Structure 1
Amino acid sequence: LLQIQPHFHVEVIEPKQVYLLGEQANHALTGQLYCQILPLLNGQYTLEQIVEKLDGEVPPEYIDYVLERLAEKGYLTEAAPELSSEVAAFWSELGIAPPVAAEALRQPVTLTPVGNISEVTVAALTTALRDIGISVQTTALNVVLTDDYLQPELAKINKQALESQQTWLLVKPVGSVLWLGPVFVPGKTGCWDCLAHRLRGNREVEASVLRQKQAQQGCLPTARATLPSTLQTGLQFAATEIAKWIVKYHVNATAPGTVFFPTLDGKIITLNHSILDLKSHILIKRSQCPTCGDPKILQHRGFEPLKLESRPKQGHRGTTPEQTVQKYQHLISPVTGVVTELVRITDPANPLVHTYRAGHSFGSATSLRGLRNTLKHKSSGKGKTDSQSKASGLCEAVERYSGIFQGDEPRKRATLAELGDLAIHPEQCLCFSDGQYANRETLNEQATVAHDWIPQRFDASQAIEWTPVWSLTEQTHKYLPTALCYYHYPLPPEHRFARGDSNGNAAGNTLEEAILQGFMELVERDGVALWWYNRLRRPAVDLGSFNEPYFVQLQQFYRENDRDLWVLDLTADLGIPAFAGVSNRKTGSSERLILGFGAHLDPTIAILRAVTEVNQIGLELDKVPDENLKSDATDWLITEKLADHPYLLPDTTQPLKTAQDYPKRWSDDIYTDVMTCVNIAQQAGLETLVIDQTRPDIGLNVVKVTVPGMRHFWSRFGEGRLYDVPVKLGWLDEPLTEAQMNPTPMPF
């Protein structure tokens, strides 16, 4: 018996039209014949028992032509006496014929509770499945019910799924947030461990609580908030997705392709019952997954040479910030992602100030103190425009993640002796003075600033892990200790010789884009170090001399917001443009001295980076009262004054720096720019080293550039450039002593 698609409502509008009105699509048929024949295409008539009721009005030959034309256009379908009128309309609406669906749902399923899921809950899901024509065997699909996605029993299920090639679905229907999915398809989707790697990083407080717990000698039960309605909502919701998967699976095993409606394969759906929000989270299959992939990928890549190539430019990056955001948006997810969120912190009405918050990163905390020290350090976006600030925030968040030690990084155990000339002593990079090391504990105990932490002396007699790094200058591999190359590398309590920092770390759309930025960050910090700790008087910059209105407009904005803004030149022996933005509050309780830095071959971009960093740090803080200030730079912001720090304001003894004071040395190619920088460094006696931190499951390129000898802008007073460069440039006639270096640490 013949019928038009059961999900269509039929309304005849007589002379030439009949409309097919659906909930998600509407169609229109034109022709008087349609008006005559369609009313009898409701399922209540045969090709036989039709002609008997309209012959003498429409020939059998005309009917066939119409009942053929509706076929190869897709309006005709068969019935299935097995399905209700309602169910059949559901599958036809997805573009699946009723009888096939009935055949698909015939396929059985298995349910497996894990964790604390009761059998009454299992029985409820069974009932939900019955009701839609799906039986449970006591398979094509295994359904696992959990109270938490990090339940250790899932690791075993996952390994068995992989060896058995069993496709399975995860669901958490208890708690105030429903988790639904993914459907794992071995050799196609990621595995549970691909997911678990993300979850473990995104559960920082839970992770540290467990550490704190174990130290006192897999997950904790937080799924406590459940209504019988939210439970039923999740089970019933899952039954629908189970049916959709089975039906899609049944048809594609036959006509692969051809069925395109979305399923939970490679996706996790979260439905927050408390606040009412539904989000879709994409699971990335990690090629370096130790369970379903090859964990040796980063090891192998690290010991092979670095291959750079031409990168034409199209503000000297090779792609738009809109595009970078677009292809890496999927990383934004507290569940499957690496970036917790990406929020515009500043007022959209303001066209000059754009700062984003990109919140979440993780570590290693074993105490409440360190746990709130983590969680406090947020990734932030910086920009002249909203789009650039967005990309900045997103990419920094992925930058910080990629630098975190996972345990698969390229490494080999050795002493400094048995590596010889290839190995770089950590002291060449850290540059702490002998006096600082000697008075470690006393000095560290006296804090105003945590990042000034003095590590234990490196003990060359100890075997350590060394990471291979590519030298762009000498075109061969060198070695840094792994502890310097990545964040949160675990060291023995009695050989804590380093804490991996972020200086020279950078993300980019390509490797050479990232390397260029990383290098410039090093010149920036080195420039600040020379200026800050020698307390040099520097010339200001005439911001009107650059063909960039933004600078002086921003100055005017600061002016209207109780502030002065000025920029100092920090350009040193490498000759690369580098600057410090400085601003003080004119009224209020405190001066709130704030600083921002930038360096770039293009001085306009360098200044722009500096001034937008001032926006990033200081302006949101002017919002919050002195008493409410919990920022790391609190004491500085409240108590310190411009009068007691003359090296902050411009030297009126020197002329204003202008655009013409900065020679152009950038090209049309980012690769060339990188090779220009490395040679500049080489002429200054410095070696440029790169470690590629790019993670395959992330994609966005991340590196750490290291130039041993170049100074960090933290309080590190070992011999070297900090003392010598200012004299080489004539800024000082004789070097300062260690005891003459700025006793006030750079607080940002």
Structure 2
Amino acid sequence: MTDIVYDVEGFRAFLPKETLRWIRHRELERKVGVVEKFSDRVGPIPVEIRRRRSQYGEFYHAGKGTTRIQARVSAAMECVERAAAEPREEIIERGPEGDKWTPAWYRTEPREWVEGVDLTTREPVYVPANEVFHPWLGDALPSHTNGLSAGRLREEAVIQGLLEVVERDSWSIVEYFRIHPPELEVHGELEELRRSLEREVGRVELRLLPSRVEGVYVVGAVTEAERVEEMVMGFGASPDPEMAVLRALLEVAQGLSMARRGIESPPGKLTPERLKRLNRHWFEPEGTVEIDDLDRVITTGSLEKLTEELVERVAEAGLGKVIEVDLTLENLDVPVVRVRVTGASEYVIDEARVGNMPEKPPG
């Protein structure tokens, strides 16, 4: 029974100030190849940028938070998870004995595997290296970082990774069927943050996405701006709808920081009004939802219980198996995991990663 002592940007067993002190003492950023740091503030939101070097090249990573401390923790741990996700021959198996997850798109049996755990059955299951590591170049589809998370504890990382998978499943459903999600109406501090971020662009719009996992809410934020590169999207998923809203808004601020520095992530220049027209489903909401009307199904006591309850709800969702792969580096004693949900949609990452899709949009 590990208490959640912090639940602003995510569910944490330590205060961000403690974690930052710990990151600094352990020299994690240096050890993970951080060579440059930048501090931004987008309206009221601190954003942190890291330039990182590895054998794979030079990369920009970002962190953010409601406080400068959390943004600096977020940026550091982002760098750590990416270093952990780099291919590691140590944990690759080639002639594995046991259960295997073989995704639909494999025309031939994959050769490299990593041992994971089925979080429903607690049985071992082998996962292809291309579904664990990044970058991995051998296979039919590109590798990616959906479900990759670091934490102070493995439970922190599991919760974060699983919520991310649900988040992208919801977003993938909206894009695949071109669903027009309802506008989400907020009050108090969240409304003030939205207004404050809106002062940076033209408009900041909130949406409640259809979630396929009960007890988990997914929120999208979309911007309208006079500059097209400043029309970004942010997403959040949490059992706490307030956290989901916060996460989406923080992602927008992060997006704006990146665009203003000309940093990108995956032909001629679009106009703001045409971008709107191509994305009518986002800009023409179907209905309205009040945040206070949303039930708190999963209330947050201990980290262990929260993990268990989240896993249960995803296992019930008709989205296949919930698999965890340990990516903790031996030298850096930092818990990192890759969470894969075998039939969750990753359409927004790759058109071929459809997952379990119904014939009709979920009404």
Output the TM-score relative to the length of structure 1. 0.45
Query: Is 1:670 aligned to 2:303, yes or no?
Result: yes
The alpha-carbon distance between structure 1 residues 560 and 483, as it changes in their structure 2 partners (threshold 3 A), is closer
Give distance in 1, aligned partners of 2:147 and 2:120.
16
- Matched with 1:561 is 200
Q: CA deviation at 1:683?
A: 1.5
**Which of residues 670, 681, 685 in structure 1 aligns to 2:314?**
681
- Matched with 2:255 is 617
Q: Identical aligned pairs, as a percentage?
A: 20
Query: Is 1:398 aligned to 2:80, yes or no?
Result: yes
The alpha-carbon distance between structure 1 residues 634 and 396, as it changes in their structure 2 partners (threshold 3 A), is farther
**Which of residues 635, 658, 670 in structure 1 aligns to 2:291?**
658
Q: CA deviation at 1:613?
A: 0.4
- Matched with 2:264 is 631
Give distance in 2, aligned partners of 1:634 and 1:567.
28
Q: Is the 8 A contact 1:341 1:357 kept in 2?
A: no
Q: CA deviation at 1:654?
A: 1.3
- Matched with 2:108 is 459
- Matched with 1:313 is 4
- Matched with 1:338 is 32
Give distance in 2, aligned partners of 1:383 and 1:643.
31
The alpha-carbon distance between structure 1 residues 715 and 672, as it changes in their structure 2 partners (threshold 3 A), is same
Give distance in 1, aligned partners of 2:220 and 2:297.
20
- Matched with 2:156 is 513
Query: Is 1:354 aligned to 2:46, yes or no?
Result: yes
The alpha-carbon distance between structure 1 residues 708 and 620, as it changes in their structure 2 partners (threshold 3 A), is closer
Superposed CA RMSD: 2.5
**Which of residues 63, 69, 80 in structure 2 aligns to 1:381?**
63
- Matched with 2:351 is 716
Amino acid at match of 1:557: S
- Matched with 1:482 is 129
- Give SS of 1:387's match: helix
What aligned pairs does 1:362-373 form with structure 2 within 5 A after superposition? 362-364=54-56
What aligned pairs does 1:263-278 form with structure 2 within 5 A after superposition? none
Amino acid at match of 1:322: K
Give distance in 2, aligned partners of 1:718 and 1:507.
24
- Matched with 1:239 is none
Q: Which has the higher contact order (CA 8 A, sep 6+)?
A: 2
Query: Is 1:413 aligned to 2:52, yes or no?
Result: no
What aligned pairs does 1:185-334 form with structure 2 within 5 A after superposition? 310-314=1-5, 315=7, 316-329=11-24, 330-333=27-30
Give distance in 1, aligned partners of 2:149 and 2:265.
23
Give distance in 2, aligned partners of 1:620 and 1:555.
19
Q: CA deviation at 1:619?
A: 4.2
- Matched with 1:540 is 183
- Matched with 1:469 is 116
Q: CA deviation at 1:361?
A: 4.4
CA deviation map 1:443-481 (0-9, x unaligned): xxxxxxxxxxxxxx4313xx6122111111011101111
Give distance in 1, aligned partners of 2:196 and 2:258.
14
Give distance in 2, aligned partners of 1:706 and 1:482.
12
- Matched with 1:736 is none
Give distance in 2, aligned partners of 1:356 and 1:708.
33
* Structure 2: runs of 5 or more not aligned: none
Q: Is the 8 A contact 1:593 1:642 kept in 2?
A: no
Q: Is the 8 A contact 1:593 1:636 kept in 2?
A: no
Query: Is 1:602 aligned to 2:226, yes or no?
Result: no
- Matched with 2:102 is 425
Give distance in 2, aligned partners of 1:340 and 1:581.
30
**For this pair of structures, how many residues does the alignment match?**
353
Q: CA deviation at 1:696?
A: 2.2
- Matched with 1:15 is none
* Structure 1: runs of 5 or more not aligned: 1-309, 365-373, 433-456, 731-748
The alpha-carbon distance between structure 1 residues 474 and 661, as it changes in their structure 2 partners (threshold 3 A), is same
Amino acid at match of 1:542: E
Give distance in 2, aligned partners of 1:676 and 1:598.
18
CA deviation map 1:84-114 (0-9, x unaligned): xxxxxxxxxxxxxxxxxxxxxxxxxxxxxxx
Structure with bigger gyration radius: 1
- Matched with 1:572 is 211
Amino acid at match of 1:458: R
Q: CA deviation at 1:351?
A: 6.8
CA deviation map 1:102-159 (0-9, x unaligned): xxxxxxxxxxxxxxxxxxxxxxxxxxxxxxxxxxxxxxxxxxxxxxxxxxxxxxxxxx
Amino acid at match of 2:47: T
Query: Is 1:581 aligned to 2:228, yes or no?
Result: no
Amino acid at match of 2:101: I
Q: CA deviation at 1:718?
A: 6.0
Amino acid at match of 1:617: G
- Matched with 1:527 is 170
Report the more deviating stretch, 563-572 or 608-617: 563-572
Give distance in 1, aligned partners of 2:131 and 2:258.
32
